[PDB]
Design an enzyme around this catalytic site. Structure first.
Site, PDB file in Angstrom:
ATOM      1  CB  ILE A   4      -2.296   1.485   2.780  1.00 25.89           C
ATOM      2  CG1 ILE A   4      -2.848  -0.178   2.332  1.00 25.89           C
ATOM      3  CG2 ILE A   4      -3.044   2.310   2.099  1.00 25.89           C
ATOM      4  CD1 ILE A   4      -2.438  -0.279   0.736  1.00 25.89           C
ATOM      5  CG  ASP A  97     -21.090   7.612   7.578  1.00 25.81           C
ATOM      6  OD1 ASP A  97     -20.754   6.542   6.889  1.00 25.81           O
ATOM      7  OD2 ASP A  97     -22.168   7.819   7.982  1.00 25.81           O
ATOM      8  CD  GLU A 131     -24.912   3.111   4.813  1.00 25.18           C
ATOM      9  OE1 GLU A 131     -24.724   4.061   4.838  1.00 25.18           O
ATOM     10  OE2 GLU A 131     -24.883   2.214   5.602  1.00 25.18           O
ATOM     11  CG  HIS A 245     -25.128  10.595   9.628  1.00 33.45           C
ATOM     12  ND1 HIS A 245     -26.193   9.684   9.830  1.00 33.45           N
ATOM     13  CD2 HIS A 245     -24.461  10.045   8.801  1.00 33.45           C
ATOM     14  CE1 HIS A 245     -26.087   8.737   9.345  1.00 33.45           C
ATOM     15  NE2 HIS A 245     -24.741   8.612   8.756  1.00 33.45           N
ATOM     16  CG  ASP A 260      -1.009   4.688   8.884  1.00 35.07           C
ATOM     17  OD1 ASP A 260      -1.090   4.312   7.811  1.00 35.07           O
ATOM     18  OD2 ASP A 260      -0.028   4.870   9.768  1.00 35.07           O
ATOM     19  CG  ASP A 264      -0.979   0.318   7.218  1.00 30.33           C
ATOM     20  OD1 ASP A 264      -1.012   0.756   6.010  1.00 30.33           O
ATOM     21  OD2 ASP A 264      -0.399   0.815   8.107  1.00 30.33           O
TER      22      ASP A 264
HETATM   23  N1  LIG Z   1     -24.588   5.659   9.249  1.00 31.44           N
HETATM   24  C1  LIG Z   1     -23.962   4.464   9.331  1.00 31.44           C
HETATM   25  C2  LIG Z   1     -22.844   4.310  10.642  1.00 31.44           C
HETATM   26  C3  LIG Z   1     -22.510   3.015  10.665  1.00 31.44           C
HETATM   27  C4  LIG Z   1     -21.243   2.584  10.164  1.00 31.44           C
HETATM   28  C5  LIG Z   1     -20.809   1.398  10.222  1.00 31.44           C
HETATM   29  C6  LIG Z   1     -21.542   0.274  11.022  1.00 31.44           C
HETATM   30  I1  LIG Z   1     -20.938  -1.565  11.279  1.00 31.44           I
HETATM   31  C7  LIG Z   1     -22.837   0.733  11.480  1.00 31.44           C
HETATM   32  C8  LIG Z   1     -23.118   1.879  11.363  1.00 31.44           C
HETATM   33  C9  LIG Z   1     -22.853   4.609   8.172  1.00 31.44           C
HETATM   34  O1  LIG Z   1     -23.466   4.972   6.990  1.00 31.44           O
HETATM   35  O2  LIG Z   1     -21.750   4.539   8.383  1.00 31.44           O
HETATM   36 CA   LIG Z   2       0.296   2.966   6.658  1.00 33.09          CA
HETATM   37 ZN   LIG Z   3     -21.463   4.794   6.599  1.00 33.61          ZN
HETATM   38 ZN   LIG Z   4     -24.057   7.084   7.520  1.00 34.86          ZN
END
Ligand SMILES: N[C@H](Cc1ccc(I)cc1)C(=O)O
Ligand SMILES: [Ca+2]
Ligand SMILES: [Zn+2]
Ligand SMILES: [Zn+2]
Length: 275
Positions: A4, A97, A131, A245, A260, A264
């Site tokens: 990728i 995130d 989420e 956050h 990266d 991939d």
């Molecule tokens: N705030 C969470 C942080 C989070 C990410 C991935 C895992 I597995 C656990 C926690 C998010 O939205 O990524």
């Molecule tokens: Ca790559």
């Molecule tokens: Zn997240």
């Molecule tokens: Zn998050």
């Protein structure tokens, strides 16, 4: 699987960053930066040949969206899914995130089209809304997926925070075949991995109804230990993501190598698990 291109993944992050800047500084549920993120991702997929679906839901008095992208073809009774939440918290652009996982999943989906791939299993990619409100979009998807379609799912692969600036390389310890596939990729790079323990992301609604799951994570607010810095570099005693956050979860909050490698690895797993 193809390699990728990191620059393409980074370019999606640049677009998400501009979308946040143009929409009050965030890409959060119920705010215009989220739907604009959906529109960007959807247009790329439509142009590549995907059949896309906008799945609407209401949470908190506000309309939310999941974006579902089905690659036409493949066995309808063996569906492999991969996904990533596309919303951010409202404090910032949510580039690590979870622009990072969203961009890697998008570039993998575009790579399938560019490669002319015909997987044996039907491929379906997802970008989840809300989420950050409590897995609301992925719960909505699983809750509204009829049991006859749930039984057709061969796996769900999740990518949530995969470019942390002080990264670790964590692989979910869930379905054994999916975990082995990711660990094998990292073994080929001679990069050690550890079991994820830092969970609460969009694979949970799938896991809880018996769908095999797995995924990749590079760490959030927990501090990197001395032993983890010895194996992966970076800075012991600092968070994996010092801008978790935060308003500083911007384009500067990415480790290019982790982004990266995990992009991939996402493509490797999607190719391997769909034959
Ligand atoms: N705030 C969470 C942080 C989070 C990410 C991935 C895992 I597995 C656990 C926690 C998010 O939205 O990524
Ligand atoms: Ca790559
Ligand atoms: Zn997240
Ligand atoms: Zn998050």
């Amino acid at each position: 699987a193809p390699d990728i291109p990191l620059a393409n993944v980074k370019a999606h992050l640049t677009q998400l960053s501009t979308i946040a800047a143009n929409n009050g500084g965030n890409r959060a549920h119920g705010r215009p930066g989220y739907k604009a993120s959906v529109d960007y991702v959807k247009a790329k997929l439509d142009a590549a040949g995907y059949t896309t679906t906008l799945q609407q839901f209401t949470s908190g008095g506000a309309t939310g969206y999941n974006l579902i992208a089905n690659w036409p073809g493949g066995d309808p009774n063996k569906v492999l899914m991969a996904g990533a939440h596309l919303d951010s918290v409202s404090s910032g652009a949510g580039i690590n995130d979870n622009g990072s996982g969203s961009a890697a999943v998008l570039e993998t989906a575009l790579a399938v089209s560019r490669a002319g791939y015909q997987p044996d299993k039907h491929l379906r990619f997802a970008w989840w809304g809300a989420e950050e409100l409590g897995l609301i979009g992925s719960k909505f998807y699983v809750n509204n997926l009829p049991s006859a379609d749930r039984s057709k799912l061969a796996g769900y692969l999740n990518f949530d925070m995969i470019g942390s600036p002080n990264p670790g390389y964590f692989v979910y310890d869930d379905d054994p075949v999916i975990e082995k596939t990711f660990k094998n990729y990292f073994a080929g790079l001679n990069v050690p991995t550890e079991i994820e323990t830092e969970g609460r992301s969009d694979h949970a609604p799938f896991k809880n109804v018996g769908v095999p799951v797995g995924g990749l994570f590079t760490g959030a607010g927990y501090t990197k230990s001395a032993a983890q810095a010895q194996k992966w570099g970076g800075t012991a005693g600092q968070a994996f993501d010092r801008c978790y956050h935060s308003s500083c979860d911007s384009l500067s909050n990415i480790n290019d190598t982790a982004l990266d490698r995990n992009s991939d690895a996402a493509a490797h797993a999607i190719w391997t698990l769909s034959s």
